[PDB]
Amino acid sequence: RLCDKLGKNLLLTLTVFGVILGAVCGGLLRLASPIHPDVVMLIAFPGDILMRMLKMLILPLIISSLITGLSGLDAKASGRLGTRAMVYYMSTTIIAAVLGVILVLAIHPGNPKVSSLDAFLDLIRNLFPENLVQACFQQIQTVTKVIKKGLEFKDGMNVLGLIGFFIAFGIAMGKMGDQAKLMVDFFNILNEIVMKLVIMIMWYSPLGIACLICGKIIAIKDLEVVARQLGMYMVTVIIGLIIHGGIFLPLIYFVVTRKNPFSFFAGIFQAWITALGTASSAGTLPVTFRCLEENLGIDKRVTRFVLPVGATINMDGTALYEAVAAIFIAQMNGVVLDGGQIVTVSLTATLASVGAASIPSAGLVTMLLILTAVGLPTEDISLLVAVDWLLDRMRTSVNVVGDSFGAGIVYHLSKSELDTIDSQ
Amino acid sequence: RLCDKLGKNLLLTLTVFGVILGAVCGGLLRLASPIHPDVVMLIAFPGDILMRMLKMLILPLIISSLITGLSGLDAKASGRLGTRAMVYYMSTTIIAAVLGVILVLAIHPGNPKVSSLDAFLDLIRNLFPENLVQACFQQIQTVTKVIKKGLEFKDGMNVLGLIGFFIAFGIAMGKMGDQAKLMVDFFNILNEIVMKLVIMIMWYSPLGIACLICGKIIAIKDLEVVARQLGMYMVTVIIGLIIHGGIFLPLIYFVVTRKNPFSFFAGIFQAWITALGTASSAGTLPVTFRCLEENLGIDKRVTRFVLPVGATINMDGTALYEAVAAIFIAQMNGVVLDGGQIVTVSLTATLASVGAASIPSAGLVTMLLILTAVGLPTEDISLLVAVDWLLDRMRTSVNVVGDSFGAGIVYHLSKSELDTIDSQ
Amino acid sequence: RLCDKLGKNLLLTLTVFGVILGAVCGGLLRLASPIHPDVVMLIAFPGDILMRMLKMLILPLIISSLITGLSGLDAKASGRLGTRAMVYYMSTTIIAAVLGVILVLAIHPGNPKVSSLDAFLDLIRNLFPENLVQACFQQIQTVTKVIKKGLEFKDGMNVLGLIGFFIAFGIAMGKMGDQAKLMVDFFNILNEIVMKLVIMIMWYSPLGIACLICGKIIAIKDLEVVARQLGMYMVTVIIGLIIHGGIFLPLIYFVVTRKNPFSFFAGIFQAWITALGTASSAGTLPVTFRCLEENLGIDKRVTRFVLPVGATINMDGTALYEAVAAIFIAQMNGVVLDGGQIVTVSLTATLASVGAASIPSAGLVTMLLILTAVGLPTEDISLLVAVDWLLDRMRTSVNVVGDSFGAGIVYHLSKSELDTIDSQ
């Protein structure tokens, strides 16, 4: 009977067993004498290997998936009803992401543990990288060294510049139409290969996460503050999800559609419960189809377009979670983030929540993308993974609720056009 | 009646209005107190963004346009005659570029404002870059540090190494014939995407150039010396164009063809006037067709090949202009150029005059390619653009004259072969 | 009668004449006064150009040949009999490689002329490069700077990380099947282009090698130690070949097949002699086919598969030679190699003995790949080429013997399957 439960989710059960084993081994080694830091380095080495493996692939993913999605997936044959959905998604997700950054900088869960103008000028300068091979590992930083300001070259990937340039590249390829089909197919092949590599690497994730946990449990001064930091991080994420799902999305539905959002929740309550249970938008998709069709009575076309694409492109709770987690790792490491990196994380949270289900088994890769877009030490992911089992259900329910409200909004903004088409 | 003039050339009129607005705003701010240099940095920021965009695009252009041109365009179905044109172009253009580099180093318009052996060895070393990913942003510089000479890695793109390697790459691809079509098409698609990006960016050029002008007017010591420097630069370009069009090209026609070049000039006078009026070789191409066909009576085939390809590959006046302008920017900044960078600019001027009309709206990109091949500060282009409205007509006229003399030379070097073919 | 000998091998005779001319000119200049080191730098400059050319081409070769071989060449239509061969090759070659590294570090031909744990951890870190554009020119090195260990970015190509990533990439390409054809063809075309470039550059090899030889002869202290160093290096290579082809391969045949290996030698004696005479596995291939078929009586299928692919993938003597030569250059320069670079050279020798005949005229490129994978000065190759005319015959003989024993081993490990197939 146990096999029928564990085997069907072998990767998840392996990761859970690895986390438990790493935590208990870390506790046992903590019960021992203060360990030689080289022995800790050997212990936490497979985690370093996993982090390096994933950070090796964070580059080809942003090179290829942006091009493939912008060129290939974006088809305007859906007409205005398509755009009314798309402009919704990239609008609500940011509202989520910024909200997280507002909350985590207000609560500062881990905090107890250059001017802003130059920071924003540096943000804009790194957003247009004057070189493209040097934007793969180097950003430009303004240094006042002591009144003549200059621009030196930092070390760290320039995620924003590459993302901007390849968004432009994908848009141009899409505008070429069919004459660029050869390169569209080439980059689609590269994307499939890189996703195969990500899946292949993530099978090694159990042992890497186990070693990361066993290397972080040993090297903390006292658990009495780390446990409180993690608890406040959970509190921040849950408060953000509540504020987004229960106050912001109903406010959008009220201001745009001007229909009672509480009736909408009464309709999609079954979908929300099924999203909490399944913890997957794709699995919950039939339930939300049934709810929005037979309960709210919205048009079949608007649902049939919005829901299948909103379940993979519109995830709000994941964006808020990733923003809060990146800022929490920044604060817990003592790294205070300026106004040029807060916007960087608040944009990479969006651009990594877009691809957190469009690319299977890429949550860790997206978290590392966010943590390396702001130059942070990417070794504290272990604390996130040790707790990223209760938040997943809530942040999936928030995504499903966001998709439902997107379907409602798009239907209410295109009812006249659909009626006119159906009349003929 | 005004829209019939401004509307047709919307980009040109936008750039002119931007330049005028930037100049008048700079004058007004100059009438104010010495401004905080940070306020100047904010003022001159959109120009910085434009230069960063263009310098971002200078890499894929030399990666892809060289491949597309050498592999795709070069087809020897034209036979010996085709070579008799090509070896002409890449010769006379150089005769232009070097000439400019001489004149600007004899007049030194902006000057008042390591041994050469090691410099040439450094030129040859950077011509064969031992690494290709490190040649995208780093050149090798010889340092005597104090008798044991060594080689360190400077900062700045290695334009010569990339150009040489990809000339070899394109030549090999062309020698593969049809078996390499699947990558010829890939690089052609990439070239079209990059050209679309250049056009898209150059629509932002008005605001960037306006801000560059308004940030350069404020931050100069006195307008007198700058105006004199610009006047001397324009005089140098005029002298170079006169010496090339009126003395060098007739000398080539005399030494090779041994026919009176003044009769040729009398014949192509109409084409020269129409080139001055139109300021475009492509628009003057029908006029030079008619002139060279019904006035000089050269063969139809030699004209039909040379002129359509010479109007886009053979521009000598543009090469002389670009060499003189790059050296003038070097002299204004006080950057004295050694014998390893003078050859660099005198080669990049040729390789940019080749692609200054094969790629629409890529003149600024070519100027930045030349200014970054020799490690110069790319912020003085505004001074060039302030005066680059009277030199355009004259350099276009010189290009058209060069194409006409190339047609004459090629016809006189293939009359026997054409006669033998026509006899059968 | 002389042209019938020199003309057929024009590249080989050109290289020999260049070596002789460079050596005699170096001797004559040695008879002169101590020369200005700048004159020596000028003399040894074409050799520097050749080294830079080849080191420029070592990157696209490992980018493209790995993909082309792992994806394209590896076809499992040969069934298990294929794997029984392949697992043999990559296991014999390593034995050939490591053995060389054992002898050269034991004999240290040129020697008279960070802990190991951190070295191996640095090996593993450089084998998983956290960045893929920074892995093209930079490795990570552990520095104890003075108890808090850190990781700083060294300078030098990260050959191992790129090889590992692109082995993974090619394996994924091959596993994804026929949907990757549009990119397999792209990389095959790129590989053929780069092979054409390697052949084109290697035609310039005579003059570069002559200048390298002259520059080395001019700039060494005394021949009394250099001649002894080269003699000991040749003795080490010969000892390694004798041990591998006389003690190790017969031991493998005895332990696996349990048949008298001396009878196997008696069977392939003609093949061994023809391999020594021809100094080429491909030319000897008909002779070893005839010997193994009509003398040992092994199955036609096993021979017809193993020999044609073993002649181009299984060269053991070349791996031993390259490992010994790289370590000999390391010792002769006074560069002591740690345990993290000994494994690097012992793996790059294996991965460059595969591509030492799969890519014609790429022996120098493979030697430079090995010498730059361990951060060595690539100017001592001339002293290898001065003696690399007697060792070629012996290493070719060892390669042919290895292929013959591979055929024997694979036949004895698949006799039952072949008999069962033939019975039906």
Ligand SMILES: CC(C)CCC[C@@H](C)[C@H]1CC[C@H]2[C@@H]3CC=C4C[C@@H](OC(=O)CCC(=O)O)CC[C@]4(C)[C@H]3CC[C@]12C
């Ligand atoms: C901070 C929050 C609580 C209030 C502010 C949120 C607004 C900035 C965003 C959230 C949802 C967005 C709406 C999502 C959908 C649309 C449809 C879209 O209009 C169209 O698609 C027209 C059709 C077409 O583009 O062709 C843009 C306006 C609007 C109302 C957006 C307006 C801006 C909105 C209200």
Ligand SMILES: CC(C)CCC[C@@H](C)[C@H]1CC[C@H]2[C@@H]3CC=C4C[C@@H](OC(=O)CCC(=O)O)CC[C@]4(C)[C@H]3CC[C@]12C
């Ligand atoms: C500094 C200037 C004023 C005088 C020196 C200029 C010469 C170095 C260049 C200028 C034009 C060149 C000529 C342009 C055209 C040709 C045809 C070309 O010959 C062929 O094309 C033969 C056919 C073939 O290549 O198959 C090369 C020689 C020649 C006379 C070139 C010889 C070298 C010339 C005279």
Ligand SMILES: CC(C)CCC[C@@H](C)[C@H]1CC[C@H]2[C@@H]3CC=C4C[C@@H](OC(=O)CCC(=O)O)CC[C@]4(C)[C@H]3CC[C@]12C
């Ligand atoms: C240091 C040397 C002198 C002794 C140790 C050498 C062994 C480590 C290597 C050398 C040759 C290798 C053998 C080469 C061929 C094979 C066949 C191969 O088995 C198969 O191919 C099964 C079919 C399949 O793979 O599906 C792996 C075992 C074996 C005996 C290898 C076992 C390991 C061997 C003996």
Ligand SMILES: N[C@@H](CC(=O)Nc1ccc(Oc2cc(F)c(F)cc2Br)cc1)C(=O)O
């Ligand atoms: N599940 C929903 C939305 C969704 O994808 N949630 C999600 C996101 C990332 C992820 O990976 C991570 C990320 C971490 F930051 C971490 F610390 C640990 C892991 Br594991 C796993 C799940 C759906 O797709 O419907």
Ligand SMILES: N[C@@H](CC(=O)Nc1ccc(Oc2cc(F)c(F)cc2Br)cc1)C(=O)O
């Ligand atoms: N016009 C002729 C030849 C031709 O192309 N002329 C040309 C060249 C570059 C250019 O761009 C620039 C370049 C600058 F250095 C600058 F300071 C400002 C600008 Br704008 C504009 C025109 C033809 O093609 O027939």
Ligand SMILES: N[C@@H](CC(=O)Nc1ccc(Oc2cc(F)c(F)cc2Br)cc1)C(=O)O
């Ligand atoms: N010959 C056999 C095996 C084979 O390839 N041998 C071989 C390998 C490399 C090579 O190139 C080099 C390498 C040097 F280290 C050098 F110093 C000089 C040169 Br040249 C030349 C020959 C076969 O293929 O059957």
Ligand SMILES: CCCCCCCCCCCCO[C@@H]1O[C@H](CO)[C@@H](O)[C@H](O)[C@H]1O
């Ligand atoms: C104090 C806590 C004690 C108990 C610790 C339990 C720790 C359980 C850790 C489970 C991690 C869940 O993360 C999942 O990882 C999967 C694969 O990596 C993804 O497929 C999935 O999407 C994602 O949700």
Ligand SMILES: CCCCCCCCCCCCO[C@@H]1O[C@H](CO)[C@@H](O)[C@H](O)[C@H]1O
């Ligand atoms: C002292 C001076 C006072 C008056 C200032 C007038 C300033 C006018 C400046 C015009 C610039 C012309 O440049 C053109 O740019 C176009 C697009 O960038 C290209 O399409 C074209 O090829 C190229 O010629």
Ligand SMILES: CCCCCCCCCCCCO[C@@H]1O[C@H](CO)[C@@H](O)[C@H](O)[C@H]1O
């Ligand atoms: C003390 C010594 C005095 C006499 C010096 C003689 C020096 C001869 C040097 C021969 C070099 C042989 O190397 C060959 O190079 C070819 C092309 O590079 C490859 O095609 C071939 O594969 C490879 O074997």
